[PDB]
Design a protein around this ligand. Structure first.
Ligand SMILES: CCCCCCCC(=O)O
Ligand SMILES: CCCCCCCC(=O)O
Ligand SMILES: [Fe+3]
Ligand SMILES: [Fe+3]
Ligand SMILES: [Mn+2]
Ligand SMILES: [Mn+2]
Ligand SMILES: [Mn+3]
Ligand SMILES: [Mn+3]
Lengths: 285, 285
């Protein structure tokens, strides 16, 4: 449908808009390039591993790789919906968000290729709870926005995408990955890339907080929708966590080799802590 | 709708895909930041101008500013359509395209703000032919892709967006701007920014060529659709050109002051040349 006018012809950008400020920070802080990461040591590390130790690492990489690819595809309807509402500064920021996620997809795929598992199908490590979030609930909630950009729909999309997928699952998975392979001294290239992902993902979560809060600000009853949508997804979050925990407890060979007391009870509580602090970044009032 | 799988879990990125290579070049060559351009001299230049000389420059800036904003909003459906076709490397590249266009919107709006015309509504310099392309034909052709991603629809979208708007109008407007203010020694910040835009816009046109050619490759009868769609838009392209030419010939005070023989007959032929060379970058066979 037609444009009825253009904000940067009638006026200018709103320079004080928080999403313009987040866009400015994204450009300053978003220069890293996955093509510059040296993965040569990661290739040697992975080759030096036993077949048993090789499994230990792949579940998390399977969840990350599909997850980055899903959000790369699935952020587009948010950008559409906010563009159609005339939120120009939000759109500008979302271009950095989308470009970040492209680099995240690229980074994991470069690592898979470098270490020699690119020809290997990692979908086996997606159980039913993972599929429910990433193959179903995430794309349903984002795609809805093409036909329904009601406050309810926008809160649900930001909750699933930014508060659950990024703010709970990815944050916990990054913690987990550091807590294991940084200790073991393994996979330096991948850990460099993950550190970059984690920096980008702070801006993505901030966008989600801003979006949810500005809707709650209009009407505190949206607050209850937010909590409800968070709690509806919790079972699949912990059901993927329990399944990875069960996979890790079945293959405790890397823990032994590298002298890691992988405390799954401590990981689990980090997931719970992440989930609960995302709730507290949204004020009812 | 659901994801049935993820390419970077089952396989990797197709590293040899031309759009992956264009994505790689976009990251290497896309570091510039409009926030780093010094516009202080542009502010003084614009203040030093007479009111008559002030008009001379605004028509082109009005067309650029609305144009960048239109393509920022209107590239999203292309990214959607190709994502839904599973063209992952195209999507990765299109994230750089979208982020480039955000910076183009930002750059013109920073210049308008710096020189003191931000509070001024430049829509008056959009005649009916401009509105037909940017307010109507462009968004219609891109938005169509949400419901109709047939080869015909994709060629039409790339033709309007990449071959006409970028490949004819923007290219000619950049030439024009250099041919005038680079000669006059005016507006150094804006000319720096335009030089950056022009570098980005080479990649955007290449995406359009690749997209049109790969469809023509399937069936040379799409070639005739391409030419037809180019010729349908030509009247509005030259009708905006004739109208800017008429505006420039009515305000020949900047030419006098700055000793510029602004050869509109030479500009006009550059537009015609641009239009015809875009046609020749698509092979029938
Ligand atoms: C032990 C808890 C692990 C949570 C890992 C989430 C990984 C992901 O899919 O991004
Ligand atoms: C004298 C020919 C001028 C063509 C200017 C196109 C400017 C634009 O809208 O990008
Ligand atoms: Fe993210
Ligand atoms: Fe462009
Ligand atoms: Mn279960
Ligand atoms: Mn006319
Ligand atoms: Mn990511
Ligand atoms: Mn542009």
């Amino acid at each position: 449908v037609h444009h009825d006018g253009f904000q940067t012809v009638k006026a200018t950008i709103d320079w004080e808009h928080p999403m313009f400020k987040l866009y400015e920070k994204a450009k300053r802080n978003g220069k890293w390039n996955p093509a510059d990461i040296d993965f040569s040591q990661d290739q040697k590390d992975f080759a030096s591993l036993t077949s048993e130790e090789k499994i230990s690492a792949l579940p998390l990489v399977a969840g990350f790789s599909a997850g980055e690819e899903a959000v790369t595809l699935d952020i587009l309807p948010m950008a559409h919906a906010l563009a159609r509402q005339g939120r120009l500064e939000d759109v500008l920021f979302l271009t950095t968000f989308m470009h970040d996620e492209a680099k995240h997809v690229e980074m994991f795929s470069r690592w898979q290729q470098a270490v020699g598992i690119g020809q290997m199908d990692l979908s086996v490590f997606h159980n039913d709870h993972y599929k429910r979030i990433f193959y179903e609930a995430l794309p349903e909630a984002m795609n809805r926005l093409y036909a329904d950009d009601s406050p309810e729909a926008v809160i649900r999309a930001a909750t699933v995408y930014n508060m659950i997928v990024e703010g709970t699952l990815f944050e916990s998975g990054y913690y987990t990955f550091r807590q294991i392979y940084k200790k073991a001294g393994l996979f330096p290239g991948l850990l460099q890339g993950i550190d970059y992902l984690n920096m980008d993902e702070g801006r993505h979560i901030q966008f989600g907080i801003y979006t949810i809060q500005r809707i709650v600000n209009e009407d505190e009853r949206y607050y209850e929708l937010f909590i409800r949508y968070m709690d509806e997804l919790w079972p699949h979050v912990i059901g993927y966590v329990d399944y990875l925990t069960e996979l890790g407890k079945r293959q405790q060979q890397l823990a032994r080799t590298y002298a890691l007391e992988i405390d799954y009870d401590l990981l689990r509580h980090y997931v719970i802590k992440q989930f609960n602090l995302r709730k507290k970044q949204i004020s009812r009032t």
